[PDB]
């Protein structure tokens, strides 16, 4: 006679929940618990709804109850683990998942959640193993399948790549059509060939998650400022980010807040992360007009209240669908204008985002349908890097002519340093090669060059020559850790050699320092063609992660490349990573997802970068950087043009010297690394948006001055 009154109420609550009547769902659940307090299923369902609402504490209460009533409730163990994981109790979530797997060895969801924990912690083989186990238990598991696909992309395991991609598109279509949450994360949707509508829709659903979480607050709409009267005519701009610290975003824009014009702007910085003690956070705190630690205010309602009370006119989302994001603050709309700027290379798909700050090269109006927001164009490029501030020691270089009778090489033994000129002025016979006010000094093979090479070869940390401090490029962390992270400018003269990284002393070096997930079989095919067409040339990659290295090599061997044609290096500290890019000849950008910060890094080294812009924002950033640089010859309209440009740079050494010098000059001459100019143009765009809103208009595309 299984049906009871409580069973009926729990069902009716399930129906109202699938209808989207979440409040009626919780009311009916609670009524069912009233009829039957020891109703384990009602406890579990109410806990699931509460966890979806963000009421994690009460949800954990109800999950623990439901598991008290039914100790074999494996699903309740798995969902309690999920709630504890959302509460940052990773140990408790792990225990929940393993207890569920112990109780029911056939339960796939717990295996998938364990794989999720492994993947979050960086154990990709373990995550792959547990995802495979879950899919073996439950072959139709879209979440496990998509997460496994991302793990394989991370490690560059392209076995059955085409079938995997087609299944991914089919799964996304099926879940969109059935109004379930898509199993592909928006940040990953740029790596798969979905329609631009598919990517926009995934972004929309993930923003709807934030909307559902903020609805429980029942906050009224905020009264937004209609003029700048209360702020002395200053536009109040608040940058919201979890990356004020040692994070790439700070490496891009840390100088921007201090360069804002105080007469017309008031700069607020809302950190979603605690102080990590690094100089990036210190700089942002000390240069912004106001720093607000929203990490002390976990309640999205109260943090949105603080943003509103500060009187922000333009709120800037620099997190998007990345880690540490709190888009719930933006879903509460505490500011009249809300704009996506820098950290997320994609659309938010969400209504609470008015603008996305981009440029004509990254997002031409033709593809304005990819983005839910209105386009707000920067004059040259929306990308910026702080390299001129973080690494001024790479503005000039010098080399040693190790190969006694060797035409001058610019990237085999390189020296950098703030005091390099004084050191060279202490040297007897420095030769000065003019590059067509810019020049490269060359140290001939003296006892001094022999001492430097001995320091490099013997693996010594540092030496002294004529009272000057000479440092091994591999020993920066041992000399000044702050210098290695980019928190400080190095105070010694650093030596970087190809011998340090196994690069050919006599061959062309193609480099790509991006995370290996940006590589797909088509990209490796193009690189293989380029390597075949250029003799002795090698490709320089990073162990990013190291478990991806064998995969690449295996595939590279099937295409006819010996293991010696690809040189892998470990990931280095930031300063060493940017510095060692000088050793390469040409960088080959990933077409599937361009190197964005990596592109800035390689261009700062003076290394020409070849890109093929795609359709997604992430696939066109390198092209936009190259246009802003003034190097249109490095942008390819197709795969064949990409390969042709790469092999021309590799084989025509005079053209290679010309283009390398062009990049070496344009990285200073162009606005690409000019943070003051970028801040001023961003201020122009800000005032454009504010005047458009102040005239009573709804947000619209902002192009032309």
């Amino acid at each position: 006679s299984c049906p009871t009154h409580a069973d009926s109420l729990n069902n009716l609550a399930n129906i109202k929940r699938e209808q989207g009547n979440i409040e009626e769902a919780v009311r009916l659940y609670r009524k069912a618990l009233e009829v039957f307090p020891e109703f384990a299923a009602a406890h579990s369902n109410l806990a699931s709804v509460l966890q979806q609402q963000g009421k994690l504490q009460e949800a954990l209460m109800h999950y623990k109850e439901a598991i008290r009533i039914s100790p074999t409730f494996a699903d309740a163990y798995s969902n309690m683990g999920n709630t504890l994981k959302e509460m940052q109790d990773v140990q408790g979530a792990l225990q929940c998942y393993t207890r569920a797997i112990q109780i029911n060895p056939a339960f796939a969801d717990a295996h998938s959640n364990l794989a999720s924990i492994h993947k979050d912690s960086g154990n990709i083989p373990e995550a792959i193993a547990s995802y495979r186990t879950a899919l073996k238990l439950k072959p139709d598991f879209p979440d496990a399948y998509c997460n496994l696909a991302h793990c394989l992309q991370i490690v560059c395991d392209w076995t059955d790549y085409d079938e995997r991609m087609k299944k991914l598109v089919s799964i996304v279509a099926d879940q969109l059509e059935k109004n379930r949450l898509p199993s592909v994360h928006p940040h990953h949707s740029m790596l798969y060939p979905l329609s631009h509508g598919f990517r926009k829709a995934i972004a929309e659903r993930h923003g709807n998650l934030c909307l559902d979480k903020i609805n429980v607050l029942h906050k009224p709409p905020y009264e937004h400022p209609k003029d700048l009267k209360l702020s002395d005519g200053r536009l109040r701009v608040g940058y919201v980010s979890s990356d004020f610290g040692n994070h790439p975003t700070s490496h891009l824009m840390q100088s921007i807040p201090g360069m804002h014009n105080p007469d017309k702007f008031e700069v607020f910085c809302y950190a979603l992360s605690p102080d990590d003690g690094t100089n990036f956070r210190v700089k942002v705190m000390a240069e912004a007009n106001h720093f607000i630690d929203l990490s002390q205010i976990p309640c999205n309602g109260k943090a949105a209240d603080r943003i509103h009370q500060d009187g922000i006119h333009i709120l800037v989302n620099m997190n998007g669908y990345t880690k540490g994001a709190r888009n719930e603050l933006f879903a509460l709309r505490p500011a009249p204008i809300q704009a996506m700027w820098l950290g997320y290379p994609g659309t938010s798909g969400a209504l609470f985002m008015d603008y996305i700050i981009t440029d004509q090269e990254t997002s031409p109006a033709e593809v304005a349908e990819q983005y839910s927001e209105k386009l707000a164009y920067m004059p040259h490029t929306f990308f910026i890097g702080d390299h001129a501030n973080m690494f001024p020691h790479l503005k000039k270089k010098a080399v040693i002519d190790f190969k006694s009778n060797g035409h001058i090489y610019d990237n085999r033994i390189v020296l950098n340093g703030i005091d390099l000129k004084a050191f060279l002025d202490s040297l007897p016979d420095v030769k000065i090669v003019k590059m067509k006010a810019l020049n490269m000094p060359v140290i001939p093979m003296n006892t001094i060059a022999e001492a430097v090479i001995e320091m490099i070869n013997r693996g010594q940390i540092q030496i002294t020559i004529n009272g000057f401090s000479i440092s091994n490029g591999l020993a920066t962390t041992q000399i000044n850790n702050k210098a290695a992270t980019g928190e400080e400018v190095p105070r010694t003269i650093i030596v970087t050699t190809r011998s340090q990284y196994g690069l050919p002393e006599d061959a062309i070096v193609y480099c790509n320092f991006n995370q290996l997930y940006k590589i797909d079989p088509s990209t490796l095919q193009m690189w293989a063609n380029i390597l075949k067409r250029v003799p002795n040339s090698v490709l320089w990659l990073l162990r990013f992660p190291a478990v991806g290295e064998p995969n690449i090599q295996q595939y590279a061997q099937n295409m006819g490349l010996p293991q010696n044609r690809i040189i892998f290096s470990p990931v280095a500290p930031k300063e060493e990573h940017v510095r060692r890019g000088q050793l390469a000849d040409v960088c080959l950008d990933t077409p599937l997802c361009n190197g964005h910060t990596t592109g800035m890094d390689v261009l700062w080294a003076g290394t020409p970068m070849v890109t093929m812009p795609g359709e997604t924002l992430a696939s066109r950033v390198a092209a936009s950087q190259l246009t802003c640089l003034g190097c249109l010859e490095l942008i390819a309209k197709n795969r064949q043009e990409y390969e042709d440009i790469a092999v021309k740079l590799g084989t025509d050494l005079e053209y290679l010297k010309k283009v390398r010098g062009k990049v070496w000059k344009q990285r200073i001459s162009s606005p690409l690394f000019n943070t003051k100019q970028y801040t001023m143009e961003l201020e122009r765009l800000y005032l454009q948006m504010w005047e458009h809103y102040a005239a009573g208009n709804k947000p619209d595309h902002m192009i032309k001055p």
């Binding site: 490099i456 070869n457 940390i461 020993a475 050699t497 340090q500 990284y501 196994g502």
Partner: peptide, 11 residues
């Protein structure tokens, strides 16, 4: 061995 030791030596 040592983190500063190079991959190969120069002539």
């Amino acid at each position: 061995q040592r983190p500063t030791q190079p991959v190969y030596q120069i002539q």
